[PDB]
């Protein structure tokens, strides 16, 4: 499989279904690459998959793509540990990959059904920018016949907050748009903050759009619960010590304008994943359980 057709398949699966996220598209492209590789050794298989992951992360500078890459490499490593013969291992891999794709396709609805019960009637929800998982949880909460008012931040560098407001008014949910600088002004009117995450780091913190850290610190200062809804495949084994420790491949190209920031686990109340409702300390355990 050529590099050009790899990028073409990635872009085609991203464009065909805008609802589906970037990490799922990357994992699908990697599984499609593994589908037709015409190889005979698992060593070259691993090397080719790693190179495909590097070029895919070259296409998109998101943390979720790299998360999916490491998760997929671990999946191949475990499958190889199960079976030594290349043909049996490869067929086991393709069936397991199909099951994995099926399970990660429906994570959003599980997170919605597990998180919509934390919204109360007459609550005031603050969210940062556009995130399909937050849209899904709010849709499920509305389907639960609950009435609430949503606040959203315009998300200045690309106005995805306005897109969130439009996609929320589509279902006639009362929503409001505030500036990036008005977040500290709005915290006291909101009851809880719900955000997504492009990547969940080892210690339980998150990587997200540049304005997430401000909301986390403001909510902590005003004693408001901070909920993060994120998928399992966004679990990177990263340990940022500060904002400078975040890898530069995720900050830029996605005066000086970073596109992401890191939020410490002490500023997060609970994480809503397809694994369930977890404390941040659980996430690390998961990773420790994954890599032996």
């Amino acid at each position: 499989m050529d590099d050009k057709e790899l990028i073409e398949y990635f872009k085609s699966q991203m464009k065909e279904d805008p609802d589906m996220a970037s990490a799922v598209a990357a994992i699908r492209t990697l599984l499609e690459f593994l589908k037709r590789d015409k190889g005979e050794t698992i060593q070259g298989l691993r090397a080719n998959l790693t190179s495909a992951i590097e070029t895919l992360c070259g296409v998109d500078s998101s943390v979720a793509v790299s998360s999916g890459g490491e998760l997929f490499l671990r999946f191949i490593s475990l499958a190889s540990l199960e079976y030594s013969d290349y043909s049996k291992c490869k067929k086991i891999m393709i069936e397991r990959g199909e099951l994995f794709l099926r399970r990660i396709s429906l994570s959003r609805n599980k997170i919605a059904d597990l998180c919509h019960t934390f919204i109360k009637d007459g609550a005031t929800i603050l969210t940062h920018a556009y995130s399909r998982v937050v849209l899904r949880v709010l849709e499920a909460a509305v389907a639960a016949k609950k009435r609430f008012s949503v606040y959203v931040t315009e998300s200045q560098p690309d106005l995805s907050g306005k897109k969130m407001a439009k996609a929320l008014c589509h279902l006639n949910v009362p929503v409001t748009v505030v500036l990036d600088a008005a977040v500290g002004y709005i915290m006291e009117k909101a009851d809880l903050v719900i955000v997504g995450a492009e990547g969940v780091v080892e210690n339980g913190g998150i990587i997200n759009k540049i304005g997430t850290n401000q909301m986390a610190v403001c909510a902590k200062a005003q004693n408001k619960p901070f909920y993060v809804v994120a998928e399992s495949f966004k679990f990177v084994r990263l340990f940022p010590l500060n904002q400078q420790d975040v890898p530069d491949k995720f900050k830029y190209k996605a005066e000086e304008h970073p596109w992401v920031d890191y939020t410490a686990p002490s500023l997060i109340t609970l994480l809503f994943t397809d694994l369930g409702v977890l404390t941040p300390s659980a996430v690390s355990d998961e990773l420790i359980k994954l890599y032996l």
Binding site: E188, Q222, N223, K224
Partner: protein, 259 residues
Amino acid sequence: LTQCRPLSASMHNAIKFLNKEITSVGSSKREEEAKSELRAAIDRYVQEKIVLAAQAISRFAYQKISNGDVILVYGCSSLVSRILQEAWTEGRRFRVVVVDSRPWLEGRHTLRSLVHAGVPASYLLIPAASYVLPEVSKVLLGAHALLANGSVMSRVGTAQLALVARAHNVPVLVCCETYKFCERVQTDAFVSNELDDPDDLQCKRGEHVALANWQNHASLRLLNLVYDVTPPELVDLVITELGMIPCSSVPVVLRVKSS
């Protein structure tokens, strides 16, 4: 009088004022004139420091009370009751949450007042306060004394309410007349306090009193604290006849009232 019961801060300030006024009486002054002037000075002190001060504090607090807000009060305070009554009379519409504590249960007094004024009211004990603070918008607390460092000396449990209100992002307002301002400082409730009668802690639960004959147990002790101290960091605003000030401005008032 101190032997009958330890003197309060207001009584201490009144004693200071009366001693200063008696010392200021000249020797050449006639005895009848001196006595009449002393009585008139006491009457004027009562008037200015209580009645006009309460009216000014009510007018000041009217601007901080809006329609549809929930105000939390603790125990019994004449200033708080007057503030709420005049706020309701002038046309503000709101509801009040009354918090009470054992064994005095003075909050019931305030409750009755509110019921006789037409103000909607709720009643609960202090341990349940954290349950009701989510729906509370402002906390209005009376003060027995304001200390030179900004701390609020009040009925035991007031600092509890201030801490729990800060935990719920609820502003805490203290109303106090400037004649209750004290030059002394106090960091905790142990160094200076009052011990009430321990037998008041006995309560009839079911058909037996568990604390009956509690002195028969050598290692058993009963503690009945009267006062506690609220640090200035737990108070958002002080309402006085001078106006709305921060706690850090309490010494400033003490500077301008003295001279």
